[PDB]
Structures are given as structure tokens and as C-alpha cells.
Design a binder for these strands. Structure first.
Ligand SMILES: [K+]
Ligand SMILES: [K+]
Ligand SMILES: [K+]
Ligand SMILES: [K+]
Ligand SMILES: [K+]
Ligand SMILES: [K+]
Ligand SMILES: [K+]
Ligand SMILES: [K+]
Ligand SMILES: [K+]
Ligand SMILES: [K+]
Ligand SMILES: [K+]
Ligand SMILES: [K+]
Ligand SMILES: [K+]
Ligand SMILES: [Mg+2]
Ligand SMILES: [Mg+2]
Ligand SMILES: [Mg+2]
Ligand SMILES: [Mg+2]
Ligand SMILES: [Mg+2]
Ligand SMILES: [Mg+2]
Ligand SMILES: [Mg+2]
Ligand SMILES: [Mg+2]
Ligand SMILES: [Mg+2]
Ligand SMILES: [Mg+2]
Ligand SMILES: [Mg+2]
Ligand SMILES: [Mg+2]
Ligand SMILES: [Mg+2]
Ligand SMILES: [Mg+2]
Ligand SMILES: [Mg+2]
Ligand SMILES: [Mg+2]
Ligand SMILES: [Mg+2]
Ligand SMILES: [Mg+2]
Ligand SMILES: [Mg+2]
Ligand SMILES: [Mg+2]
Ligand SMILES: [Mg+2]
Ligand SMILES: [Mg+2]
Ligand SMILES: [Mg+2]
Ligand SMILES: [Mg+2]
Ligand SMILES: [Mg+2]
Ligand SMILES: [Mg+2]
Ligand SMILES: [Mg+2]
Ligand SMILES: [Mg+2]
Ligand SMILES: [Mg+2]
Ligand SMILES: [Mg+2]
Ligand SMILES: [Mg+2]
Ligand SMILES: [Mg+2]
Ligand SMILES: [Zn+2]
Lengths: 68, 114, 134, 91, 251
RNA sequence: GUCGAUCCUAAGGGUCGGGGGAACCCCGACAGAUAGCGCGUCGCGCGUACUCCGAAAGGGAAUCGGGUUAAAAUUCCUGAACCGGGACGUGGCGGUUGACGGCAACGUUAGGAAGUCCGGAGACGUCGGCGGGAGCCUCGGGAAGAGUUAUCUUUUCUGUUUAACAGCCUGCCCACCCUGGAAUCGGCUCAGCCGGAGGUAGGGUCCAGCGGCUGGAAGAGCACCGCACGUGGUGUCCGGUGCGCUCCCGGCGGCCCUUGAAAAUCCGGAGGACCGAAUGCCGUCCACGCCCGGUCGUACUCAUAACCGCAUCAG
RNA sequence: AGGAUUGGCUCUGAGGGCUGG
RNA sequence: CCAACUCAGAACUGGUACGGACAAGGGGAAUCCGACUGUUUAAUUAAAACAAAGCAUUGCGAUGGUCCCAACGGAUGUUU
């Protein structure tokens, strides 16, 4: 498992053809965006809840988004 | 207190059967075999370690498993000789070669003596 | 002061260019404000020319005559002064200000390369262009 | 204080082996465990690694010497004898 | 009777030499053109201990005469040798401790070690710690040399035989008392299965000529003739004399 | 595929040729046109008579939690990784044909290369003292449940969890580098010991980690309280202590007429034959993507009843 | 060899670490 | 402000009890033998017997000493 630090980088890896699914984990102090790729599970942490909603609706169509 | 057992069929405390105790997310202690200590690269004569290279088992140095920058030193004889040893050889090579030129010239002045 | 002067051939003793031959361009015996120790600006050979022989073709010989140079500031304790001299004009090509910017450094190295190659082709200073073996 | 009147280093043998053998072995016991002058670096840092092998801690020079002393008495005589013969031949 | 201890050693088995940790045979270079005519320079890299051998050994690196490679050698270390020293082998090598020269080039009275018996055999005489041979005289007509061996015997060897200048390092080893059976145990642990030794008079008749009797005693002269067959040849073999060596006898 | 066997070599074993022998057999690479390997594309170069057996405690490519059975699991399930191969694609990198930075120790993710040559790792005794890490033990506070309660007890007990792997940080004890030039000698360990062969001091580099943070990962596990008879909620927190115990590591010292394996395998280096482009090809140990994973062992006992002793034997 | 001391309870003294010019 | 447990002393006190169980040398004056540690008759002998360091003698310079082998060869010997 690897951690993505930039939202821009997370979007780039979300558009990869091997990105099988994306899962949204909402904790009590942040939201984690996890994208399952061929080799690694990339995770992005977004402390600001409001800033996380904007990214949630910006994901490419066809990618299986799940809420945890 | 919780007591442990070997996780393999190796029942003797050999150097290759070393282990560490780890507490798992399940709340229990368990063994995990630990690889033996490795020396890492060393100088041919003095035996001092070669700086800039980690100490790993021989298979862990394999190019596919270790990045190139971690198994090299950017200098002549890098990873084989220390900086001091390389400096000694360079000076010795230059000074010895210069002395040969002096010997060659010195015998030409005496050869013509006749 | 006496022998550590420009055009004096030296041999690098440390760093990634240890064992390379170089020529002093500017000497700072007193040391600048940033560097309070004796040092000099040298233009050495990173890649020596190959062995040029008669049987090689003209195209092959031209490639084997190529030289690659480096511009660097070096402490006096990290060079070995020699009795050889290389009289090539480098006062304008190589300067302290050059090392400040990467683009300037590349241009000076290319210009220094041209003056080393032309000197090499004349057959003079064979020792300077010969690889030190150690 | 003076812990032993005369036994010295052979006090590790207690009351065993007889006084003469302890007295006899004391000479070599002291010599083989002492530091010797290094002609190369100029320091008293030469100690025995194994019988006949003497290494300097500082400069790392390893020298072949006597079993229990760096230089045996016959070793000095041999060097002078060889030196005399060399001078005559090289005359 | 049964096979006595002395007879069981020849079969090998548990009496073979313990050589697991030995560094290899110590010998001169193979005689070649360079040593026969001129000299070849070598460098001592390390002085090492050889289990079972009192004398230290020296690892020397040579430049191969006609191949592009290094030539490794293992020499019996002479007293005074040190790491980083240059060692010269050949006919024209100078007379200095550590150099290997043919006996023809070594003047009379010199101290030498690891002396060859046959030209090119790479050294058989005076190899133990503190031992040496003394060059006595040369015979240009016969091309032979006289040397005095450590035992005090004079031997004729061809002048082409090589020898190292100096004496073997590690001398004086046997002067130190062992003081303990354990020290003897460790000494012979790395040599061979020869210790401890049981006295023949302590055995039964079945396994030794000296065995038996209601008192411990030999019962017959311990001096046995040269031609006695194996199993009978025990004690003082072919003794020219016995008893304390006094006067000229101990010379 | 990940635990082993399998591979490697040890003491040694079995052998060719040769030498012996009526023969069964004996010696065992010692009497000899070795095995072949490498690079081009069949040719050149190299080439010292064993491509053999010999370790389920020596050496050694890679797997971790959680869950699951009446009986199996580091093998099954789920999730997350890794190793060894095979193939091409995209992007990146280099061309001053073969990168850049640092005075230096060295740093950075890439960043030519054949025959030949060189070094290192693998790789090593024992004892003693110190130092570091992990697990355990132990003390206090917070919260959860339980025990005691005629009396006393802000009390007693149970627990209060965090895997491989990935990134970043840290930089032990040493080693190393730069500046500088020391007697009124100083620095320094429990013990040593170190310094014009450059100390103290100042500023750096590197190395260890079973160290820290984050990802993995709370979604898990555990505890407790509910609702139904699967499902929801709460908590899993904050410190101290050590000639303590077990294991691992570091560094130093003692000891030897004792100096305490080998090979497979892997890494690095010296050398530079040969090779591209006038800028489009060539090169690339970089990132990502794609494919593949043999055979055999695996239950259970390991013992005052599963082994041997005639037995369910006080051995 | 020979001799003295040793429980419980309530105290006293001595032996440290880290911060603050 | 935070500390762990070693040492020393004093008062008081019990039916002089207190290393309260557990744990855990009897001591001395001599003779004989073997120096010591070690080893030994598994299943009647553990010893004064064996070994031992030390001491002494003997053979042998490799075309060799000692020994194994039917023969060829081999052990000591990776030796001097
Ligand atoms: K490195
Ligand atoms: K018989
Ligand atoms: K024995
Ligand atoms: K005996
Ligand atoms: K008898
Ligand atoms: K194995
Ligand atoms: K081993
Ligand atoms: K699993
Ligand atoms: K692992
Ligand atoms: K199983
Ligand atoms: K039993
Ligand atoms: K004992
Ligand atoms: K023989
Ligand atoms: Mg020093
Ligand atoms: Mg004896
Ligand atoms: Mg008897
Ligand atoms: Mg008889
Ligand atoms: Mg395995
Ligand atoms: Mg073998
Ligand atoms: Mg057979
Ligand atoms: Mg045959
Ligand atoms: Mg052969
Ligand atoms: Mg094989
Ligand atoms: Mg095998
Ligand atoms: Mg194993
Ligand atoms: Mg089971
Ligand atoms: Mg090695
Ligand atoms: Mg001890
Ligand atoms: Mg500790
Ligand atoms: Mg410093
Ligand atoms: Mg976390
Ligand atoms: Mg939970
Ligand atoms: Mg243990
Ligand atoms: Mg190169
Ligand atoms: Mg099982
Ligand atoms: Mg069971
Ligand atoms: Mg059991
Ligand atoms: Mg039976
Ligand atoms: Mg009497
Ligand atoms: Mg006794
Ligand atoms: Mg017994
Ligand atoms: Mg009995
Ligand atoms: Mg008995
Ligand atoms: Mg006596
Ligand atoms: Mg015969
Ligand atoms: Zn020295």
C-alpha cells in the first residue's frame, strides 16, 4: 500500500485503465480515498470534509465508487 | 504469560532459526524469523567498511531488489576501495611513474659517456 | 603561490573525478569569502580520447579523438600538482561566474571541449590527454 | 598496593605446576603479552596475534617474529651476518 | 596376540592427519625462466597462522610471467618478514632476508631456510619455526653445495637448489613449558591422533611385547634390532647406545 | 511460486582412464586427445581429467495479518504484499555518443559496452564488561465489566490490540570528511585508550534498527451495553520505572605451542575492443501496464499409554 | 580455628536525575 | 519538578523470639599413597591403577625412519 499526498496525483492514478475501484472511508477527522490498482492500493487523505466532496464528484465515470 | 512455539518444523536454535516477537492486531504474540546479520562490503586489506552501502544478505543486493544508487559509489574503485585507499594509489601511480622517467633520463646521460 | 598558478597541470585525488588530469584556470591561495581555504578553478578531462591508430578509418579516428571536459572548484588538499604545463587560453571561457548557472556551465564545458580537442590533435601535451592508470 | 610479592602474572596458576615451571614460564608470559616498538610508525603498539605473528595496532603492519618476543636473539645475529655478506658481494 | 598400536597407525583410519583448517601447502614458486636467469618481484600481503604448524606463513602475490593475471603463493615466513614488503626471487636477487636465491648465488656462511633438495622441488629442508641451514662451501667443479642441516648433518645439494635468506620465524616456541595436559590436548588436536600415549608396560601381553607380569617391567632388553618385524619392533630401535648422553656423546 | 525436501558444498562416498587381480574384487582423477564455456552467425576465442552422491540442525530467491473445520492450514477464505521468469507497449532519462550535484566524506530514481582481469559479501572460536532495540515483568492515572462489602477498601481482578510490506523521518556505537594547528598537554572508558601519521573544538558524511510517523488500518480484533432470536452503539486513552528476565545487535577487552569450514549464489570494480546521431536514430540496472508458478512431504503422538525396552514397563 | 549479631514496629542520616542566567 | 533501592544508625516492643518453614560446611592433630584437574572394569573393584605436564633415551636428511597392503599402491605427509 502507498499513500498519495496530492489530490492532483490521485486523480491521475484514478484514470489509469487498471484502476478497478475506488472506496471512500469517512473517519471522525478526515476522509480517505482508496483506489485499487494492479500492483498497489493508493490512499489519499483529505482532512477537510467539504474539500473531499468536490473530489468525490470529480471521479471518472465508470469507476466503481463505494462508501465505507 | 503467553508462551510461543516455532512456526516451522525447525526445532533447534541455529543461527538461521533466529526470530523476533511481534504482537499482532489480534492481540497475540507470534514469532517472525529474522535474517542473520550481514557484514556488508569491506576494504580488501584494512577491513574497514565501505561507506554508502547498506549491510544486507547477498541475495538482497540483487539488482532487481535494490536500487542502483544504494549499491554503488560515484568514484573510481567505488564500492571496492575507500576514498583514502584510492587517494594513496593515485599518488603512488603518479610518483612511481615519474621516478621511472628520472631513471630513464639518468641512464641516457651516462650511456653517452665514452 | 609559486607553482599553483594557471596553466599548471594537476591530478584530482578525491571526488567523482579522482585520478583525472586537469589544468588550473584560476588559483585562490587566500581563499574567497565563502571558501576560507586554498582552492582553484580547474578544467579537467572527464573522458579521455581513445587510442588513435593508423588502421582506423577517418570516421572511426574522428570519434576516437573526442574529449569531454568538466569545470570545477577544488580544494588544494584534493589535487596533486605536477611539473607539466598546458598552455591553452581559458581565461574567458572558464570563470567563477560560469558555475553559478547550469546553462552557463554547459556552454563553457562545450567551449573548453573544443580547445582541448584541437590541442590534442596537434600531438602536443600527450601526457595530459593520456589516462592515468592506478 | 603490591598484590603479590613475586608471583606477578603467573599468579593465575595458583599453587599448581611447581615454582620452577611457574618461574620458567613467567619470562615468556610477560614477553608475549607486552607491547613492542613499531619501527614503521614509531609507536609502542605491536602485540602478538598468534605465535610468531606480531601486528601493529596503529599502522596495521604485520611482522613475522619470534614465538614469544618480537625479535629473537638469533634474529639480530642473522641480520648482521647477512648484511656483512651482502657488502662483500656488492663491493 | 593382537595388532599393537604402532601397527594400527599405518592403515590410516583414525590416525590420519587433521588438515581441515590448513591453509594449503607452503612452497616456493615453480622454477621458471624468470627465476633461473633474472629476478621476479613479489609483495607480501598477509602473515597468517597455519593450524598444526608453528611457523607462520606469508601470502605473496606475483605478476604472472606471460599471463594477464595475478599469481598467488604461500611461503614459510622468514623471521623479519612484514606485510607490504617486496620479496625478490631469482638468480640475481639481492642477498636480503626474505629473498629466494639459488644456492649458487649465496655466499658461504649465510643462513637460509626452506632449502630445496632437488632443483625445482620447491623446498624441503629447514622449514620448522626457528630452524635454518648454513651454507658451508661451494664446489664449482661438481656444481654442488655443502649445507649444515638443523640436525647437525652435512649434506650435498646441487647449486641450483633454491633457498630463502634468513631463518624460519616463530623460533623459541618449544622453550615455553605446557604445564597442562589440556595444552597438550589442544596442540595435538590440530595435528593427528597421537596423544595421550599409554605405556606398553601398562598393557596386557596380548597387545604389547612389554605387557604383563606381576610387576610393571619390560623383562627383556628394550633395544630391538633393525630387522625386527612389525609388531616386534618396539622400544629403542637399533640403539647404538643407551643411557644418559654425557661427554662427547651429547655433542 | 513464498513452510521444507529439491540447490550448494563439509568429513567422506561412488567412479572413468590407468595400475593390480584366476575371478568375486583392490587403489581412486594417482600412468589420460576433460567437461565444455563465451561471443558472433556455422565460425572465432578460451579451455588445469569427475556438470556424480553426501546436511528436513551448515550455506540458501520470495507471505503477512484477520477469518474458517467434528478432524487441515504462514497451504483453505478475504484483504494486502513479495520473489523468480517471459513478452511487448506507454511515458521518462541520456547523446558534449554514454546524466547531474557536493571542496570533501558522498548524494540523486534512470544515466554505454565484449573477451580478459581484480576485490568484497556468503564466511564463521570462546570468555568477560559495558551500551542499544524488542517482548515480558512492574508502578500511577482515565474509562469498561467483574469480585468483596456486618465493618474496612477513591479498593481487588480482567483486559484496554496493531502484521508483512511501502514511503518519509531519525542517525545509536563506530568509521569517515572539511576547517584549524595543540605543553600550563589535553580528550576520554566501568575497564581501556586516542592525538603534528593532526587531538580538543566547530561543522558535516556514512552505517544499525526488532527506532519514530503515515499508509496497510479499523472496515479488523477484543471488551462492554443493546435490539431481535442477524443487527446497532460505546471504548480501545495518557505517563513513569530498571545491576529485572528472554532474545537480537553494537563496541571494547581477555585467552591460545588451540587462531576456531567450504561451495553455490550475489554485488562491486579495473580495462574499453565495438556501437548512434547530425538530430532521428541508438541506448537505457527508471516508472507503470500484461502473462506465467512443476514434483513430493503436510493428519496425529513425541511419550509415567502412540518411539525402544517381549507390555498401556517408576528405565 | 575462635567469638558476636539477626524479629516486629516507629523513625534519623547518607548515596541521584531532568529543567531554569 | 521527578525518582529507584542499597547502606548505616537510633528509640520502642514481644514468654531471649527472630537465616523462626524452606534452605544450608562439623571442626582439629597426624601417618600412607598419588603432585594437581582429568580417565577407568556398562551389570559386584573409582583406586594407591591409567593419563598427565616435566625429565630422559632411541631411529630418521625423503634413494629416508615407522607402519598398512594379495598385488598395485598407500598412512605419517597440506609434513621436513
Ligand atoms: K551509495
Ligand atoms: K593377531
Ligand atoms: K587420543
Ligand atoms: K603414558
Ligand atoms: K612385562
Ligand atoms: K539444508
Ligand atoms: K558455517
Ligand atoms: K491470509
Ligand atoms: K517478511
Ligand atoms: K499440516
Ligand atoms: K517411558
Ligand atoms: K574439575
Ligand atoms: K615414507
Ligand atoms: Mg593512529
Ligand atoms: Mg609422554
Ligand atoms: Mg592391567
Ligand atoms: Mg606377545
Ligand atoms: Mg524457504
Ligand atoms: Mg571431500
Ligand atoms: Mg567400490
Ligand atoms: Mg577401469
Ligand atoms: Mg591429473
Ligand atoms: Mg551439481
Ligand atoms: Mg547433492
Ligand atoms: Mg538449513
Ligand atoms: Mg492441527
Ligand atoms: Mg570474503
Ligand atoms: Mg576465564
Ligand atoms: Mg539490555
Ligand atoms: Mg570532529
Ligand atoms: Mg495508522
Ligand atoms: Mg471496531
Ligand atoms: Mg540461550
Ligand atoms: Mg568503465
Ligand atoms: Mg500439523
Ligand atoms: Mg494433542
Ligand atoms: Mg512435546
Ligand atoms: Mg524387539
Ligand atoms: Mg614417614
Ligand atoms: Mg590422583
Ligand atoms: Mg565408565
Ligand atoms: Mg563394575
Ligand atoms: Mg562402584
Ligand atoms: Mg621429577
Ligand atoms: Mg608390494
Ligand atoms: Zn606501526
Amino acid at each position: 500500500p502507498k499513500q498519495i499526498h496530492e489530490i492532483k496525483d490521485f486523480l491521475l492514478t484514478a484514470r489509469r485503465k487498471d484502476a478497478r475501484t475506488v472506496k471512500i472511508k469517512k473517519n471522525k477527522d478526515m476522509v480517505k480515498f482508496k483506489v485499487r490498482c494492479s500492483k498497489y492500493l493508493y490512499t489519499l487523505c483529505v482532512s477537510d470534509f467539504e474539500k473531499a466532496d468536490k473530489l468525490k464528484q470529480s471521479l471518472p465515470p465508470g469507476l466503481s465508487v463505494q462508501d465505507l | 504469560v503467553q508462551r510461543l512455539t516455532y512456526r516451522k518444523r525447525h526445532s533447534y536454535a541455529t543461527k538461521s532459526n533466529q526470530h523476533r516477537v511481534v504482537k499482532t492486531p489480534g492481540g497475540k504474540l507470534i514469532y517472525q524469523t529474522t535474517k542473520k546479520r550481514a557484514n556488508g562490503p569491506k576494504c580488501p586489506v584494512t577491513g574497514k567498511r565501505i561507506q554508502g552501502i547498506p549491510h544486507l544478505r547477498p541475495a538482497e543486493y540483487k539488482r532487481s531488489r535494490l536500487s542502483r544508487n544504494r549499491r554503488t559509489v560515484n568514484r573510481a574503485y567505488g564500492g571496492v576501495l575507500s576514498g583514502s585507499a584510492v587517494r594513496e594509489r593515485i599518488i603512488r601511480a603518479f610518483l612511481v611513474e615519474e621516478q621511472k622517467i628520472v631513471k630513464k633520463v639518468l641512464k641516457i646521460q651516462k650511456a653517452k659517456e665514452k | 603561490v609559486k607553482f599553483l598558478k594557471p596553466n599548471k597541470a594537476v591530478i584530482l585525488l578525491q571526488g567523482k573525478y579522482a585520478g583525472r588530469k586537469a589544468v588550473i584556470v584560476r588559483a585562490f591561495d587566500e581563499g574567497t569569502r565563502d571558501r576560507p581555504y586554498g582552492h582553484c578553478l580547474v578544467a579537467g578531462i572527464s573522458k579521455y580520447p581513445k587510442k588513435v591508430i593508423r588502421k582506423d578509418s577517418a570516421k572511426k579516428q574522428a570519434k576516437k579523438s573526442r574529449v569531454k571536459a568538466f569545470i570545477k572548484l577544488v580544494n588544494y588538499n584534493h589535487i596533486m600538482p605536477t611539473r607539466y604545463t598546458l598552455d591553452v587560453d581559458l581565461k574567458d571561457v572558464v570563470n567563477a561566474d560560469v558555475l553559478q548557472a547550469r546553462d552557463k556551465k554547459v556552454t563553457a564545458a562545450k567551449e573548453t571541449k573544443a580547445r582541448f580537442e584541437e590541442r590534442f590533435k596537434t600531438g602536443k601535451n600527450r601526457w595530459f590527454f593520456t589516462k592515468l592508470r592506478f | 598496593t603490591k598484590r603479590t610479592k613475586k608471583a606477578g602474572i603467573v599468579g593465575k596458576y595458583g599453587t599448581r605446576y611447581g615454582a620452577s615451571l611457574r618461574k620458567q614460564i613467567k619470562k615468556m608470559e610477560v614477553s608475549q603479552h607486552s607491547k613492542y616498538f613499531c619501527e614503521f610508525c614509531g609507536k609502542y603498539a605491536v602485540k602478538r596475534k598468534a605465535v610468531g605473528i606480531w601486528g601493529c595496532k596503529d599502522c596495521g603492519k604485520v611482522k613475522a617474529g619470534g614465538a614469544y618476543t618480537l625479535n629473537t636473539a638469533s634474529a639480530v645475529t642473522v641480520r648482521s651476518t647477512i648484511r656483512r655478506l651482502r657488502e662483500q658481494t656488492e663491493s | 596376540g593382537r595388532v599393537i598400536r604402532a601397527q594400527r597407525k599405518g592403515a590410516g583410519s583414525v590416525f590420519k592427519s587433521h588438515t581441515h583448517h590448513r591453509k594449503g601447502p607452503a612452497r616456493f614458486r615453480t622454477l621458471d625462466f624468470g627465476e633461473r636467469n633474472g629476478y621476479l618481484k613479489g609483495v607480501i600481503t598477509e602473515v597468517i597462522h597455519d593450524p598444526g604448524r608453528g611457523a607462520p606463513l606469508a601470502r605473496v602475490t606475483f605478476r604472472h610471467p606471460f599471463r594477464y593475471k595475478h599469481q598467488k603463493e604461500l611461503f614459510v615466513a622468514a623471521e623479519g618478514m612484514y606485510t607490504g614488503q617486496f620479496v625478490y626471487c631469482g638468480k640475481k636477487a639481492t642477498l636480503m632476508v626474505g629473498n629466494v636465491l639459488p644456492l649458487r648465488s649465496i655466499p658461504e656462511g649465510a643462513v637460509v631456510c626452506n632449502v630445496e633438495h632437488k632443483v625445482g622441488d620447491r623446498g624441503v629442508f629447514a622449514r620448522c619455526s626457528g630452524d635454518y641451514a648454513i651454507v658451508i662451501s661451494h664446489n664449482p667443479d661438481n656444481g654442488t653445495t655443502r649445507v649444515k642441516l638443523p640436525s647437525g648433518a652435512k649434506k650435498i645439494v646441487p647449486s641450483g637448489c633454491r633457498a630463502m635468506i634468513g631463518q624460519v620465524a616463530g623460533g623459541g616456541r618449544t622453550e615455553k613449558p605446557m604445564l597442562k595436559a589440556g595444552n597438550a590436548y589442544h596442540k595435538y588436536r590440530v595435528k593427528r591422533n597421537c596423544w595421550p600415549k599409554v605405556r606398553g608396560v601398562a598393557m596386557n601381553p596380548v597387545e604389547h611385547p612389554h605387557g604383563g607380569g606381576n610387576h610393571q617391567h619390560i623383562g627383556h632388553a628394550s633395544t630391538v634390532r633393525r630387522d625386527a618385524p612389525p609388531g616386534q619392533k618396539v622400544g629403542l630401535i637399533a640403539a647404538r647406545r643407551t643411557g644418559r648422553l654425557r661427554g662427547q656423546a651429547r655433542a
